[PDB]
From Swiss-Prot, chain A:
Keyword Hydrolase: no
Keywords on record: Host-virus interaction, Inhibition of host innate immune response by virus, Viral immunoevasion
Superkingdom, taxonomy of origin: Viruses
Family that this chain belongs to: Belongs to the Caudoviricetes Gad1 anti-defense protein family.
Role, per record: Counteracts the host Gabija antiviral defense system by suppressing the ability of Gabija to cleave DNA.
Designated name of the protein: Gabija anti-defense 1
Gene Ontology terms: biological process: symbiont-mediated suppression of host innate immune response
Residues represented out of the complete protein: 132 to 293 of 295
Quaternary structure and interacting proteins, as annotated: Binds the Gabija complex as an octamer and inhibits its ability to bind and cleave DNA.
Reported phenotype of the disruption mutant: Knockout of this gene prevents the phage to overcome the host Gabija defense.
Swiss-Prot record, chain D:
Domain notes: The N-terminal ATPase-like domain seems to have lost ATPase activity, but may still bind nucleotides. The C-terminal Toprim (topoisomerase/primase) domain probably has the endonuclease activity, but when expressed alone (residues 348-578) has not activity, showing it requires the N-terminal ATPase-like domain for function.
Organism of provenance: Bacillus cereus (strain VD045)
Description of how the protein assembles with itself and partners: Homotetramer. Forms the core of the anti-phage defense complex. Interacts with GajB; 2 GajB dimers dock at opposite sides of the GajA complex to form a 4:4 GajA-GajB assembly (GajAB). GajAB interacts with Bacillus phage Phi3T Gad1 protein; this interaction forms a 4:4:8 GajAB-Gad1 complex and leads to GajAB inhibition.
BP terms from Gene Ontology: defense response to virus
Keywords, ordered alphabetically: Antiviral defense, Endonuclease, Host-virus interaction, Hydrolase, Magnesium, Metal-binding, Nuclease
First-to-last residue of the parent protein present: 174 to 308 of 578
Protein name as catalogued: Endonuclease GajA
Its biological purpose: Component of antiviral defense system Gabija type I, composed of GajA and GajB. Has no detected ATPase activity. Expression of Gabija type I in B.subtilis (strain BEST7003) confers resistance to phages phi105, phi29, rho14, SpBeta and SBSphiC. Expression of Gabija type I in E.coli B (strain ATCC 11303) confers resistance to phage T7.
GO function term, MF aspect, one: endonuclease activity
Gene: gajA
Gene disruption phenotype: When this gene is missing the Gabija type I system does not confer resistance to SpBeta in B.subtilis.
Amino acid sequence: KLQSHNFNLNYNLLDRIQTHPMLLETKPCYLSQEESYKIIRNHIKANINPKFARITSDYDFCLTVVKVLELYKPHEYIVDLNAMYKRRKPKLEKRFQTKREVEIYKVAPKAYQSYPIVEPFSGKDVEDLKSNIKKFLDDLMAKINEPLVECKCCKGRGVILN
Amino acid sequence: CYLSQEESYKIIRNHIKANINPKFARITSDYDFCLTVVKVLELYKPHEYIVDLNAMREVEIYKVAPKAYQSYPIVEPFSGKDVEDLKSNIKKFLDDLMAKINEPLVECKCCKGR
Amino acid sequence: CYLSQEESYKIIRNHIKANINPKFARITSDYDFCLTVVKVLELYKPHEYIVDLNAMREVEIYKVAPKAYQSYPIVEPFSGKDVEDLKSNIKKFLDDLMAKINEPLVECKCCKGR
Amino acid sequence: ESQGNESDEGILNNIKSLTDQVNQQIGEMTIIKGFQQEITSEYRSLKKEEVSIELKSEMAIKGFFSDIIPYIKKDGDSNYYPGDGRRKMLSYSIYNYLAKKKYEDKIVIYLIEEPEISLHRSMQIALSKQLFE
């Protein structure tokens, strides 16, 4: 059946000596750090529903996807365009917003700002590693594709399945 | 004997800080020029965050300022006929106000907090 | 099995803010890098400033910080052999810590709190 | 030079916490986070260096002492102003204030050259009283 894997993988330095290279695939393995982040970033770009969630910052060093939820009543509030400066007189302006965006998932291949570092993918077998990647990949996608309407009974607060 | 604007704001701030129910509400901004109270939209109080680790919309009630500052509401200077009229008026104002702050949150039905 | 240095600080802050009793103790510095809760060296709780208008040394208890910051005592990472053992340890430390902070003030005896 | 008591020390530490929170809050803005994230990518594309670019207020980094300045505040007015003649007059009171309590260990000689330049004649008489009376 062979490895049949496009992505490269690594093994423990100590346990390689006693084994054979052809027998390395069945032994426990872990994926690379940047490789793990690259896999997650590439799948997210291809799989997220644009309506349900929006990806704000995708970079080689950071990744942020936020959840877009629509408030049934169009939210209206007042903003100040002079709020960045204290001395001059305030000037008010009306703004209507309908899609309130909340941060859901964010990750980085390495320590950058406050982003959480992605953990490397690990598996006892190359196919076991693939299943672990697939299961976690589907879990993340499922969190992204959660439906989004706000409660009429529960004004404000959060979301209800739809 | 009408209380002025500044010390009227002082007693509300001191009373709010003194008797508040942190399980039900919290103070975000506590400044001599502005005061903000928000509602804790979160569950029962004892050790909720301590159990979810094992498994591994903001709202405001009262805003007040002694003087015009940003968009904060202006505090009203307490007025009354005499000293005991102030004491009665101030007392009832604080309780009805602060009952609103410490009022237990609405379960809100269909969203059940989500 | 031990919790992270920052995570250890995070839970104490969130839970201290939860059950804090404004009658006995007050939270002064509440920042992502430091935390300082002091006692209320003051008399009975309800309606003192009100009777004041009718008439007409601060002590810190807990100081913690996730990282070395100013002179704040450093936080300790919750370490447990078993995760449930850690959960029992984290709870016991918190009640011991927070029963201390809610302990009613001493009567002050000789100087009568003056 | 002035003595610092414990209460002032507590206020000094409290201010440092406030300025730190200001810098932390700046980094929490979306437009600030958006710019510094992409400008980091632009820099990384320029040169493969492992750095990050952050926007912080200069005062919050150096400390409140770095940019503290006197403000001539007219009584009954809440506005703070950086007039011009009052600046010249107040600049002399700083010299007056320092003269009293700055150099107690040396002989201080003042070389005042043409003080009347761009000075109102009423202020010239005021300076005359300071020099001789």
